[PDB]
Each structure stands twice: as C-alpha cells, then as structure tokens.
C-alpha cells in the first residue's frame, strides 16, 4: 500500500522536477533527461514529453554483480531494459535585440 | 491477453538447450562491443533513436 507506480504515462507533458515513477526496484531505468532519486524514483530533468523505449543494457564496470551476470551470458546475448525519456519541448533560449547601439 | 512479437525477438537465435557447450563472454569489453552493434541495428520496438534522431598501389605500399 505504498502507492508506488507510474505517475506519467507516454505522451504526457512534464515539467522539470515532475516525478515520472516510484518503483522500489529498478523496473524502469532512467534514460534521457530523466534523473533518479535516492529512493530509486524517476523524475524529469527537463520540460518535455515522456517516452518509454527498450534499450540495450550496459552496466557500469564498477558495478560488480551486474558485470558478473554480463560475463556469464552466451556470445550472442544482449540484455534489454525499459527506459524512460523526456524529449525536451522548448529550446534553451532565443537571441533578441535589446539595444540598437 | 498476449500479442505475438512483430519481428525476431532478441536472444531468440542463440537460445539452445545446451548452454554449457556454448561459448560465453568472459570480458566486459566483448559484451560492450556486441551491445553497440545491437544498438545501431534497426528495431521494430520503440527506440531512443526514433525520438532523438589499385593493384600497383597495394604493391608499392607493401614494399614501403
């Protein structure tokens, strides 16, 4: 009864800070412009549109247990995970005339 | 309720009854290389890319 789950589905507009999903375990991995909190909750780093994709999973080399699992896989095997992305909707800014010096 | 895959599901081809007989990655780098190969390949599922997208000459050089 912890109320954890997806808060923003695919195609939902998000603002920076908005929590995409709370999970407890890494069900959905953070992708592009998606931060991860201490509690493993995913949040938008940018204002944009939420997308879910399947991407190839390459763990950090320092991550011992994951690397072990990787090194136990057959030669053709690649691991896939679900990833949450934010496609940014607005440009960083614009150049406008302020002084006709 | 289930829907069949719209293409070849990954890791399907290499799936054999005998796994001990099959050669494995022993290194992080080998898996990594194969991973980039897969990443570059087109896929039927939603991807990140979709949203964020002379003989004389030879002889002379060999001699050199």
């Amino acid at each position: 009864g912890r109320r954890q789950g997806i808060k923003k589905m695919e195609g939902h507009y998000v603002h920076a800070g908005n929590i995409i999903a709370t999970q407890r375990h890494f069900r959905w991995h953070p992708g592009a412009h998606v931060g991860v909190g201490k509690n493993k909750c995913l949040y938008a780093l940018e204002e944009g549109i939420v997308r879910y994709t399947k991407e190839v999973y390459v763990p950090h080399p320092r991550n011992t247990e994951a690397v072990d699992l990787i090194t136990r896989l057959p030669k053709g095997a690649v691991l896939y995970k679900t990833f949450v992305h934010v496609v940014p909707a607005k440009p960083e800014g614009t150049f406008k005339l302020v002084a006709m010096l | 309720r289930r829907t069949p895959p719209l293409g070849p599901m990954p890791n399907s081809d290499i799936d054999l009854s005998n796994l001990e007989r099959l050669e494995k990655y022993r290194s992080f780098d080998r898996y990594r290389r194969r991973a980039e190969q897969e990443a570059q390949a087109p896929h039927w599922w939603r991807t990140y890319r979709e949203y964020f997208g002379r003989t004389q000459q030879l002889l002379e050089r060999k001699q050199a």
């Binding site: 399947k54 699992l69 | 719209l6 796994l19 599922w45």
Partner: peptide, 19 residues
C-alpha cells in the same frame, strides 16, 4: 508489458543457469 508484443524482452536468466 504483458499484453504488448515487447513482453519478456528483458528476460535474462533463462540464458544463464546459476546452479
């Protein structure tokens, strides 16, 4: 997701036998 055709795309430990 179960209903979707991309169900079980992240199945990993059928490939390994940790016995």
């Amino acid at each position: 997701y179960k209903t979707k055709p991309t169900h079980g795309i992240g199945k990993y430990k059928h490939l390994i036998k940790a016995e």
